[PDB]
Design a protein around this ligand. Sequence first.
Ligand SMILES: [Ca+2]
Ligand SMILES: [Ca+2]
Ligand SMILES: [Ca+2]
Ligand SMILES: [Ca+2]
Ligand SMILES: [Ca+2]
Ligand SMILES: [Ca+2]
Ligand SMILES: [Ca+2]
Ligand SMILES: [Ca+2]
Ligand SMILES: [Fe+3]
Ligand SMILES: [Fe+3]
Ligand SMILES: [Fe+3]
Ligand SMILES: [Fe+3]
Ligand SMILES: [Fe+3]
Ligand SMILES: [Fe+3]
Ligand SMILES: [Fe+3]
Ligand SMILES: [Fe+3]
Ligand SMILES: [Fe+3]
Ligand SMILES: [Fe+3]
Lengths: 89, 91, 91, 89, 90, 91, 90, 91, 91, 91
Amino acid sequence: THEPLEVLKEETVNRHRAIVSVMEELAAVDWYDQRVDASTDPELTAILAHNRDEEKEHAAMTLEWLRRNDAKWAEHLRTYLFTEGPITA
Amino acid sequence: STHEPLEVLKEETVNRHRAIVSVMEELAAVDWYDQRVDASTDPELTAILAHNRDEEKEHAAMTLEWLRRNDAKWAEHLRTYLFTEGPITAA
Amino acid sequence: STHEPLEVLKEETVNRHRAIVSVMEELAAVDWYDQRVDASTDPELTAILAHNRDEEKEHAAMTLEWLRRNDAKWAEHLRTYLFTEGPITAA
Amino acid sequence: STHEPLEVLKEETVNRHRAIVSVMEELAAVDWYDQRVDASTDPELTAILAHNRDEEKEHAAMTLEWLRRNDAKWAEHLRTYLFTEGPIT
Amino acid sequence: THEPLEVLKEETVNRHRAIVSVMEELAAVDWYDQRVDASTDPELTAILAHNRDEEKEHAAMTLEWLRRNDAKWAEHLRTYLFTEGPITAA
Amino acid sequence: STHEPLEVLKEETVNRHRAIVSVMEELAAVDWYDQRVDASTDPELTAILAHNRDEEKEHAAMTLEWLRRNDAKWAEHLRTYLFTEGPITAA
Amino acid sequence: THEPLEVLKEETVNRHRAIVSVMEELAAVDWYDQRVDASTDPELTAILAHNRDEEKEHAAMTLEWLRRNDAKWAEHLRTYLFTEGPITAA
Amino acid sequence: STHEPLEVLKEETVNRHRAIVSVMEELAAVDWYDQRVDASTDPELTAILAHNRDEEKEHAAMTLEWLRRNDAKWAEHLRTYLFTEGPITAA
Amino acid sequence: STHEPLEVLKEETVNRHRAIVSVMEELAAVDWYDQRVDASTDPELTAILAHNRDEEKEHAAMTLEWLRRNDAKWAEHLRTYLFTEGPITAA
Amino acid sequence: STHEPLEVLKEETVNRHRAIVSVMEELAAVDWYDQRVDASTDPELTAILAHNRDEEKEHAAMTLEWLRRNDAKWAEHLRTYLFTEGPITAA
Ligand SMILES: [Ca+2]
Ligand SMILES: [Ca+2]
Ligand SMILES: [Ca+2]
Ligand SMILES: [Ca+2]
Ligand SMILES: [Ca+2]
Ligand SMILES: [Ca+2]
Ligand SMILES: [Ca+2]
Ligand SMILES: [Ca+2]
Ligand SMILES: [Fe+3]
Ligand SMILES: [Fe+3]
Ligand SMILES: [Fe+3]
Ligand SMILES: [Fe+3]
Ligand SMILES: [Fe+3]
Ligand SMILES: [Fe+3]
Ligand SMILES: [Fe+3]
Ligand SMILES: [Fe+3]
Ligand SMILES: [Fe+3]
Ligand SMILES: [Fe+3]
């Protein structure tokens, strides 16, 4: 954390634990997908791709927790997720 | 900024990389601002930090929707868990 | 996140620190997004990256104004150079 | 120091990158010096640190003006908030 | 990679991809377990613990690949895994 | 070195942390040495690097066995996949 | 700092503050000088070059403070600064 | 991993670089393992950490001997100080 | 280790870069050693740390003299402030 | 800068940490300088870099001797391999 825990509210520190978890999951997805493209061993590629897609599940579960515990995550995710049409509108 | 040479990476893999790292940086900004909002002792600064914080969540949501539309398993797993009720680990 | 122990830092110094590091992070995001806007090969992603990029500039601007209002030398030097004509080094 | 290959970046984008990172480093120096000014217990050193600190703000202001002149959205947003009177938000 | 790809054999580079994956999985196991102890929200704690134990599975699968593709991983893992008695005397 | 305050971590969690970061450092050394073994143009150095490399694998295996004996889920997952035949993802 | 502040003398910590400041000035000098060579905008280049040279003044001022507050900085700086001929021979 | 482009470095410089960074990594492992031995509260883990630690010292010593044999000033300065008597500075 | 591509950097700029980063590394070593001299509880180690510390200052001074001889503004500003009397800001 | 809380580390472990990290920094300086010696195109600078380089080796040898005198396993393993003539991986 960037600020002393003494001044952070309990909810802020739990959301921090969730946010940094999603960040690490996102990094694993990207790392694994790049290694899937570059790997020259098909058995390794199958393991990497399997783990990659489970990191996406890990991230989705934690993002749902954030949505349920943060009004503005809920509002903004409701606005854009599972839509059609230009996203910037 | 990629882990493997760009010559061996598919074009779509690199575009998802650009989106993924963007979402990561937005999430980092949400966390950073929320912590600074708790710690700040200047009300005018707090209002700015909180304003920015919640717009970073919008940036993250937009980029995540692009990722969802361009990656089948992001779409599948987000569909399983987002906007649900009851235990998340049971959905 | 501070380089000196908080016990010896004035409250206002820590608040300006919170503002300065926020501007720094916004500036990094602007640069990161602008480079991805040039390199992106998906137009839908590019529009999102460009939208976010320009809102980071607004976040930086709001926090910069707070700094101007809370630091006399930020005020002096920003007054000298921002919104001028002619060579910048000669203002 | 760029995140994308120079081959795909427009020339103006790389110059704005040079300006942006310069402002970031100036901002970092302002923050570092101001903290050391508070903590220093030697008046002669403190005077030097404060002198350097305030010149870093001038370095940042000049480079920011270049950005304002070379990026329409920097100009737009800086004009909205800089040198204003009421609540910033 | 720490050396130019031009001087690395393909199998060395594939083992690198596997090794670094295991490293990242281990780091995730450690991070999640600490967050499980520290979390004060029961729903978050259940997610963190679920993710933690699946990272161990990711690591195990990747370790088996290393065992099958590296004679000294095979030898040393065979010597120590699933043993009884002092680990430093096997 | 811990991500959470030691005050809230169970002793076993901290000891597993010590073992896990040790295995990570062994793995990094294995990878670093193997690449330097491939790139080195001095056979006497190569022989030292290769010797050290294979001993790091032993240090990792010893520490993993400690993890296996002190963590039921390490024991379960390692039992499932190590020393198998056939597709690794299906075991 | 690398050691706990309770065991560090006051003068050591002030010298630390000056030393780290010189290091950051030197880094800015190097960064700006490389951007001056690479920049393709003359108006930007003039700003970068102006800032670059003032960093040198910030480092020089702080180094003088070190010289006045550290006997060995004073000795070694006097031996080599403003000399002629092979620097390693002084 | 080098600070200068490989095209301007002599072969002998890059091999010494490989050895030096190896020794640095071994030294770091000795230090980490030694601190963990002091802090560990599981005797079985402590025996493993202490075993690995002491083998890292052997890895460093082997690689350092290679440097001594491939660099005239390493040989000169190590001969001056290692295994001496009396104040180290005055030797 | 440069921030701009070497093809657009002049030879002299790169040589100045080599000198500047060397001075930076010397300064860091001076600081690191001086803190360890204060904190060490072993007198013979303290004597080695202090010996090394003072030679790093000599290394920095030599390299800084090279910079002075190869950069007009280093020569100007070091001339103005080094070996002066009175308020350092007033010189 | 320790990896474990100072409250649980023995005094001798902390002093060995101070020496170990010192050698690591000396080694890194040797490597950095040696690469700059090869890449430098200014003979006056190259002479300084080479002079400094070789003194860093002396700094490393002095601190390494302290380690030898204050750690039984460093002494044992250094004695086995330093100042030998036969193949290193054969004791
Ligand atoms: Ca492929
Ligand atoms: Ca295979
Ligand atoms: Ca004030
Ligand atoms: Ca004060
Ligand atoms: Ca001035
Ligand atoms: Ca010990
Ligand atoms: Ca000497
Ligand atoms: Ca002999
Ligand atoms: Fe995961
Ligand atoms: Fe944003
Ligand atoms: Fe922002
Ligand atoms: Fe500056
Ligand atoms: Fe995983
Ligand atoms: Fe090891
Ligand atoms: Fe400066
Ligand atoms: Fe080792
Ligand atoms: Fe030195
Ligand atoms: Fe040194």
